[PDB]
Design a protein around this ligand. Structure first.
Ligand SMILES: Nc1ncnc2c1ncn2[C@@H]1O[C@H](COP(=O)(O)OP(=O)(O)O)[C@@H](O)[C@H]1O
Lengths: 182, 182
């Protein structure tokens, strides 16, 4: 979830996975491999209250079930579920449930971004805050927005999926504010 | 009956011509169409080998309408006039001639269309007034691009009810098959 996800190439992902297997078998002796690691190593806090290992059939049944209940809730356009969007939804939920999570999704335009996040925020009870852009958009308005969302997150004890686009990052001096915020 | 039996390759290729090959010139348009047709013939779909896009997708009624209109006798511009109607999302017209403006403001009269552009002074509030009204436009010369119409170009999903559609920034939107902006 930390390293194999970020790599561009499927060959790089395969090399990372097989070396994960290699290091696990090298420094975890006398342990059966078929239980030590498998292909669907997936965890969620929804099947139980523990991150129990989840097999392909039950996780796919869950993902069909959640999309079936999400059909009539918000999205009138049918979201298509498959091997990559399932993985990305579980990755984004793991990052949301982790403390101080902060995810950099690098990929082509459209393709699932700002709809996977909106969907996950809707099914997890989070709030969505987006920044509008006018002319002469100074950093003071952004600072006020950051102050209000920080007081909502801390003072009003409310988990926030603060989402930002490439259209509200045109200025330069306020970019490093998120750096020290992280 | 034969058209139902071999509608597959032909209408798939015509729709793919509308979708993908709109940026390219006549040479690349025809190269894409012929390569697609050869591969579809190799895909056990035996269709009309001799098909032109203006004779398959569109009809001679609108062909004669555009020929008798101010549009000149030229296959590229008649094909683009066909593309002006068989589209889905808001397009751009990359043109050095700019003759589409008189087309739009000549065949668009009953909607009380307004002449708007990008470099004019009537854009800091006329764009907002056009968003409030819900009227089509042909704003031109995109070199000082306004990032506030990205939600309009993006067509977000927000369902609350039903009225005259406009994809605003910070206000509720609706759905209707009436308005489209160029
Ligand atoms: N896996 C997917 N299944 C179905 N539709 C998808 C998928 N990924 C992206 N889309 C579609 O691609 C479009 C691009 O999304 P995007 O424009 O980023 O959403 P937004 O309108 O919030 O900006 C969306 O309208 C979405 O319906």
């Amino acid at each position: 979830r930390l390293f194999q996800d970020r790599l561009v190439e499927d060959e790089e992902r395969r090399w990372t996975d097989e070396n994960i297997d290699t290091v696990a078998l090298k420094h975890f002796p006398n342990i059966d491999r078929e239980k030590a690691m498998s292909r669907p190593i997936l965890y969620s806090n929804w099947l139980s209250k523990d991150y129990i290992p989840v097999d392909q059939e039950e996780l796919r049944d869950y993902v069909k079930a959640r999309l079936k209940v999400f059909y009539e809730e918000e999205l009138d356009v049918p979201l298509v579920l498959f091997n990559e969007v399932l993985d990305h939804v579980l990755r984004i939920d793991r990052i949301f449930r982790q403390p101080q999570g902060h995810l950099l999704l690098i990929g082509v335009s459209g393709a699932g971004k700002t709809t996977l996040s909106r969907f996950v925020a809707w099914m997890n009870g989070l709030s969505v805050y987006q920044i509008k852009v006018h002319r002469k958009y100074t950093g003071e308005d952004f600072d006020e927005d950051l102050r209000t969302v920080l007081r909502r997150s801390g003072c009003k004890n409310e988990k926030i999926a603060f989402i930002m686009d490439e259209s509200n990052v045109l200025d330069s001096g306020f970019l490093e504010r998120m750096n020290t915020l992280l | 009956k034969n058209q139902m039996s071999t509608i597959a390759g032909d209408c798939l290729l015509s729709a793919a011509f509308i979708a993908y090959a709109g940026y390219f010139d006549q040479q690349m348009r025809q190269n894409l169409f012929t390569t697609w047709s050869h591969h579809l013939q190799q895909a056990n779909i035996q269709f009309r080998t001799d098909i032109a896009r203006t004779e398959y997708l569109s009809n001679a009624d609108e062909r004669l309408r555009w020929q008798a209109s101010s549009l000149p006798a030229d296959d590229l511009c008649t094909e683009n006039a066909i593309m002006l109607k068989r589209f889905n999302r808001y397009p751009l017209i990359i043109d050095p001639s700019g003759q589409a403006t008189e087309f739009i403001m000549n065949e668009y009269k009953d909607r009380k269309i307004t002449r708007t552009s990008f470099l004019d002074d009537a854009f800091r509030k006329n764009l907002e007034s056009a968003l409030r009204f819900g009227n089509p436009l042909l704003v031109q010369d995109v070199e000082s691009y306004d990032p506030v119409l990205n939600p309009v170009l993006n067509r977000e999903v927000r369902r609350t009810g039903g009225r005259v559609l406009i994809t605003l920034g910070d206000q509720d939107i609706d759905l209707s098959p009436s308005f489209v902006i160029f």
